[PDB]
Amino acid sequence: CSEVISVTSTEEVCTIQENKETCTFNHATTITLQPLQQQTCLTLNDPEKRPMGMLTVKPDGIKFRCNKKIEFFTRDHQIVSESVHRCHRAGSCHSDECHHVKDTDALPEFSSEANSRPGYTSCSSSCGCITCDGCFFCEPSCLFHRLYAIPTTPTIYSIFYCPSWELEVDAEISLQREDETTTSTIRLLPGRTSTWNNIRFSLIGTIVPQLPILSSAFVTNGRQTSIVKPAYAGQLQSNSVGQLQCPNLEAAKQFECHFSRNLCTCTNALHKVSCTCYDGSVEDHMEALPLPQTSKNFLVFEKDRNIYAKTHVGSALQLHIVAQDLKITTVKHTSHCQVEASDLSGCYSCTSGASLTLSCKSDNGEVLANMKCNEQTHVIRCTESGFINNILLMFDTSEVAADCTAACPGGIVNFTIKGLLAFVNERIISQSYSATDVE
Amino acid sequence: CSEVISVTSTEEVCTIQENKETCTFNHATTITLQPLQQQTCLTLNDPEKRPMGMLTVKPDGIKFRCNKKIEFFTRDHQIVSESVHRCHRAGSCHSDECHHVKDTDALPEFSSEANSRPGYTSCSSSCGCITCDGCFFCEPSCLFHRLYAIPTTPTIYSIFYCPSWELEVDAEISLQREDETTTSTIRLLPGRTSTWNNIRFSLIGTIVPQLPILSSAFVTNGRQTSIVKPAYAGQLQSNSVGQLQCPNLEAAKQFECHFSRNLCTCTNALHKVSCTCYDGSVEDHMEALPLPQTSKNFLVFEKDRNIYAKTHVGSALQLHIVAQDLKITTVKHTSHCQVEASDLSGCYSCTSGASLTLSCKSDNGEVLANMKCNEQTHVIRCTESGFINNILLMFDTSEVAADCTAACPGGIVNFTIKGLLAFVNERIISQSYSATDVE
Amino acid sequence: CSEVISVTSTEEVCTIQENKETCTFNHATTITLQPLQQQTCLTLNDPEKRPMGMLTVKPDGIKFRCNKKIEFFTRDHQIVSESVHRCHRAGSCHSDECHHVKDTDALPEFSSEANSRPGYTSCSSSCGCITCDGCFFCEPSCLFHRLYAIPTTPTIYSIFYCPSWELEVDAEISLQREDETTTSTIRLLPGRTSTWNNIRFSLIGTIVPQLPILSSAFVTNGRQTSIVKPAYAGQLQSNSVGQLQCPNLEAAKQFECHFSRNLCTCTNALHKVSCTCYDGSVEDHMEALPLPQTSKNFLVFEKDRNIYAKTHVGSALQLHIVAQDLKITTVKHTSHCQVEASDLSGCYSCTSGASLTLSCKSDNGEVLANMKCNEQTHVIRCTESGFINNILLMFDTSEVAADCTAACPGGIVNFTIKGLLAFVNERIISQSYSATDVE
Ligand SMILES: *[C@@H]1O[C@H](CO)[C@@H](O)[C@H](O)[C@H]1NC(C)=O
Ligand SMILES: *[C@@H]1O[C@H](CO)[C@@H](O)[C@H](O)[C@H]1NC(C)=O
Ligand SMILES: *[C@@H]1O[C@H](CO)[C@@H](O)[C@H](O)[C@H]1NC(C)=O
């Protein structure tokens, strides 16, 4: 098996029954486990029959459930322009009638059927003369201009942050007395002593690393999700998820959704005012950094519409087991180990890890190795046969060549890690898009 | 009483006095408490007189004090416009005199008494001809335009984030030997062994959940406060708290406070240039999400100008008690329980919790129940009589109907929870406001 | 020495060798240390020879390594303008040729050698008449306008956040049996039992405070660094680090770097269109809040291109030591203490702490003092001689005068702390800068 570190102590508990009291001696064992998909073994025994069956714990990690906050709905959108200009003393082009135009004024002046769709209106005044537009008097030309936004795809996008991530620890827990194997599954919570078959498990300690990726906009296209650069309700931060503000789901499907100016910077030409803006299709921002999103210490995955995020190595659960009328003793599994390296793969200085594949053999039950590169420090759990490991280190250069020294409970094993890593680009787009439909 | 989980161990400490040494045996007890406004009982005893008095601990939760960072002062503001236009060869409307106008140039051209108030100037050039404004020569008309900002209410608004929240644990701690009751109050800190009367308390462990709402703009209108979507010093992020940048308190009262363009998008008309902007009155953003602000795991409340934020259920303090020359033993309080449900209330997918009210009886000293709905998992502390509980679950749909199964140390108790939850809208306002005072 | 709080327990471990089993009794000791640059002593002994040598632990704190995410490159930049206007029926000033100008169109119309540098183009149309520009026909004057950006200094700026900060604990660990001193240095990790000479150290607990400054833009000018108000890839948030978006290092040196409009708000004059923008030189934002950046609970320092950040007081490591075939016992060091105060210094309500200097004497081996002001609570480790302490309290007013009561294991010591603190201003600049080079 593996090698954990433990403490054995005495627990004395007095139960209060109806007008009655019954005290109980016990033995209890606090074991400190780095979850790491280990195989943590234990041995039970009473004073009388020293063999009583082996116990096995396999923590699937330390996970955090999300507590959503649906903040911000949006849709694949395409912002378009429109304009219409008149001569003097015609339509609304007189003293102050075009000058008192309202922002949301749906004009009955060649505004197409899409007038209802959200947007903004504006009144400009260009030169008016017999060589400026072609009228007969030299009176300024009023220019009605209308921006709005169409959708593109019949879907909706739910943006949400996630405060108050809640702790949980699920463990595959098996027991082998003489012949059989129960291998139940348990859901431990930070103070709530669960009881699978006959033993009480409690989550006494958590040493999670401070990981501030847990506060960031998870976007959802129904079944699909991703992480994104934050955007906040009411600010219309351009060129990020949600330069369109749709508050309600029904407000999205019916498409009553506000956006802001400062996106499309219009410049006048007196015939076809040119408005250039960003062609925001959020699906891109999603594709920039989607889920699941593994990394060195954490990984953030959805499972039936709930964004769990767990950690493997940087943390160390601290568990407390009580065998009813027994006592527990761990098992230290001494064994050397051999290491088969590989070539690095992926990006350097990225939220993802510089990938690897370190096969390793144990000539014995699976044991743990505290791998130590130049700076970083990871762990692996290599066993008798094969058992590759993808471990996602975090170097920050292009060329990498270092002497990473694994260390199993036997003798350390030096080796070498080489590779050439490429830098990714998050993304970029400046204002180079425009589209107008004049009528 | 309740049921906590404990460890009893031996502590041997040798005190160094002046050229002297005195060692001491002891008994010590580490108990793991989910604060939850419990009533955690304990029983003291020496080898000689096994009754020595009961001890009672009632943790008020795990709280975080704030360490302010006053970043950003602002005021209820209303941005206004003004303009004045001239004919040719008059005032400053000649070769390049209007073209070299400075940004902060307080012009002596019909700029009212409010000229001193912050803002911006601009020089436009509209058509000039005998039908454009009414002058006699066909030379462009220079247009002086001035934006500025007035206050509305004689108050000030302090924006501040809060890094380095500090840990604290206050506990109501009572003792009952034979006749009386001391019920002191203690302030435990993460490593500093306090000593109330004759026993040493130390905060050995904290399992707080990762809660990234603790980094967000707390706004303060003196006695009142609230949480808000972040805004940063120097960016003038429109339509959020502080499109006005006031650095100093005295700089606010005297009102020397900068704001930026990109708020009011002006469009020319040669007589009354129309500038539309947001009517930012921060009191609104405050009313969007004020304090106190309870939720499922945490609540954030101010108490005498200090923003504490504590947690109840998601966490589990780990305490370490030492009775001087005694030993401690907990008490397990077996008792079944009955549950009286209620109807859900509030919002779904919101930082607030889907409210409930679960009365429950214990037929014995107050005990703990590990309530388990479909996904969520809360705890309650129901007792002999009445004792409602508001618990703020976190469902994420409109209709909700599930089989939540409470679980007391006796037998579990199935029941059903139904409700219809409504979605709230954070807020939204596009540029639909404008106000001008031409003279 | 100091006074720590401990637990002594029994550990029984059975090692599995090749087809062999060997069990081992032991003694183990879990000590709870607030790192605080203490001198935590310990005493070893077996049943036979009760003197076996003193042990000394000196934790350098609880530190967090950064796992970079290079997001955003930029450079000291200066944005400039340019323009050129023509008469009618000349160049590209006809029906719709200036009106179909592209955004990134490098025009062969007096666009200087710097045309290649990034920017934006625009076509305006001012009055055209015999008194508007001086042509002979009264046809509008097309105005070609070009914004771009030059660099200033031949350096590059790396912006990066830092998710998944990893835990580490380095400790100076010495031992003194009879004559000599080994004073090794150890690197403890959250679950990985290190072994310096003959004893196993493990990091069983961490009570770090929730500190949300650990998610903020660290900017780097090569050897220099600082903390800054966040900016995100693709949003071009004006007046903060990176209104220029340079994705790649090579893309910066060659200077192919995008920026956005909404910075320089141009206003037409038909000869010299005036464009005013912010003169962003990031070195300023760096100087606003540079590293190292000490505070009350944490400090964030770089050491060979790696941003460590450690904490001193608000936290309490929980360590677990095992002496091979011995047992450990702490030492309590009773001693009164004298305190020499000082005058406060620095800012109030700032991420930095209100500075102090509290000399203090111990008349014995260095001991610990739980200093308690009106609200705050710090700790110091004063010793026989001198030993100043800079402790960085966090008051939030200008005038401060309170009765801070130190408390050593002997009798408390009242004193008084006075001072006058000044408020700092983060920074501010509105649009008051412009520069044009017409040709
Ligand atoms: C492994 O590499 C380390 C470098 O840190 C070196 O100190 C050690 O001697 C090496 N072990 C070998 C070569 O067996
Ligand atoms: C309570 O509901 C659970 C569903 O999770 C079910 O398994 C159990 O049998 C129920 N108990 C009853 C009906 O007594
Ligand atoms: C020290 O000040 C405290 C105020 O909190 C007071 O209660 C105590 O009596 C003082 N001790 C003295 C004056 O010795």
From TrEMBL, chains A, B, C:
Residue positions the entry lists as glycosylated: N414
Cystine pairs: C1-C41, C14-C23, C66-C162, C87-C135, C93-C142, C98-C123, C127-C132, C129-C138, C246-C257, C264-C277, C266-C275, C337-C408, C347-C350, C360-C382, C373-C404
Descriptive protein name: Integrase catalytic domain-containing protein
Organism: Ancylostoma ceylanicum
Source organism phylogeny: Eukaryota, Metazoa, Ecdysozoa, Nematoda, Chromadorea
Portion held of the full protein: 2330 to 2768 of 2828
